[PDB]
Amino acid sequence: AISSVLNDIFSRLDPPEAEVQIDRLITGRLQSLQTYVTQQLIRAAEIRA
């Protein structure tokens, strides 16, 4: 995205152009959340053994 602030997208860009730039920020933070849950499940299996 152009800006990482969700308030800067909605107060400046058009609302057809805002739904592209906000949904890139939602999807990229969920890929970091998918990385974080998966690495804790590997460390839960190493601490189980």
Binding site: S4, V5, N7, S11
Partner: protein, 327 residues
């Protein structure tokens, strides 16, 4: 909160245990809108409040840069004859910052009110002054009958009827040269195939509608890649401490509370952020003060309940929040 367990787990039978449902959040109530000081005012009295004037070709621009001009008291009063412009509202000019502001003063006849337009052609606008097609400003006429007029006419300033070619915008032509229609040279005077463009003003307050003096100020607005040094005033609100509110600032929009900050700051600094690039400290625009930005009080809600075939009794757990901070 027993029914908060059924909405999250999507089942009507709640097993015995502890289940996390939602998160408690204190909602914001009021809103704080801040705007800086109106200090260092700008001399806009050389156009609107000025006694003297010039003619339609003699117009002198007033350079407006690095100052705060007040247009806000004129829009709430408005003793204005006719204002007409295209695409930009004159009432929306007060909250916008404009980089290059130019203003002039010229007095026109009452039939020349329609001759001042963006994209205007004729025997008035093409031969003296006209507005360009890319002009983003707006024009305000003002009635000159109580100040600038004179009994029986004005013989001090004159206007030009004719010109040998079409004249561009952003041009000042003070030349006295005679329009030559034919091949006969005029030699500075009227004659055969020569028209004399200079005419005196007819301006008197007791004449009719078709000629009256009108003070006309063209506000030239230009927005470049440089930041704007000229801004208009905006009405603001007060400052609320230790309550959950929405933030509306010049460069910041957020939600939180305002507490006293002990951190040192830079005099050229409005705001500053932390590791997450979220603003934890801000300078007030009117006075010099630093306020620590903290978010509003939140906590997790856990529901401790038995089974639905046993009891309806609800025990509510608030995680991370002390019991004095629950109201």
């Amino acid at each position: 909160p027993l029914s908060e367990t059924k909405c999250t787990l999507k089942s009507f039978t709640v097993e015995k245990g502890i289940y996390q449902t939602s998160n408690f959040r204190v909602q914001p109530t009021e809103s704080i809108v801040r705007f800086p000081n109106i200090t260092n005012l700008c001399p806009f009295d050389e156009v609107f409040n000025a006694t003297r004037f010039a003619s339609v070709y003699a117009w002198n621009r007033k350079r407006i840069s690095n100052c705060v001009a007040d247009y806000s008291v004129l829009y709430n009063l408005a003793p204005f004859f006719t204002f007409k412009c295209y695409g930009v509202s004159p009432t929306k000019l007060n909250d916008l910052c404009f980089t290059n502001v130019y203003a002039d003063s010229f007095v026109i006849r009452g039939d020349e009110v329609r001759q001042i337009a963006p994209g205007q052609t004729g025997n008035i606008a093409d031969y003296n002054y006209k507005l360009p097609d890319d002009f983003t400003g707006c024009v305000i006429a003002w009635n000159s009958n109580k100040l600038d007029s004179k009994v029986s006419g004005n013989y001090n300033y004159l206007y030009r009827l004719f010109r040998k070619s079409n004249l561009k915008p952003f041009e000042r032509d003070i030349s006295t040269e005679i329009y030559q229609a034919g091949n006969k040279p005029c030699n500075g005077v009227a004659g055969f195939n020569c028209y004399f463009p200079l005419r005196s003003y007819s301006f008197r307050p007791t004449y009719g509608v078709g000629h009256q003096p009108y003070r006309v100020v063209v506000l030239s607005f230009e927005l470049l890649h440089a930041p704007a040094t000229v801004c208009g005033p905006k009405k603001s609100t007060n400052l609320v401490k230790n309550k959950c509110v929405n933030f509306n600032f010049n460069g910041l929009k957020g939600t939180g509370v305002l507490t006293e900050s002990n951190k040192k700051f830079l005099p050229f600094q409005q705001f500053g952020r932390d590791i997450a690039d979220t603003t934890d400290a801000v300078r007030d625009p009117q006075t010099l003060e630093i306020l620590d930005i903290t978010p509003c009080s939140f906590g997790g809600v856990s529901v401790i309940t038995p089974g639905t075939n046993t009891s309806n009794q609800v025990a509510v757990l608030y995680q991370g929040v002390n019991c004095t901070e629950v109201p």
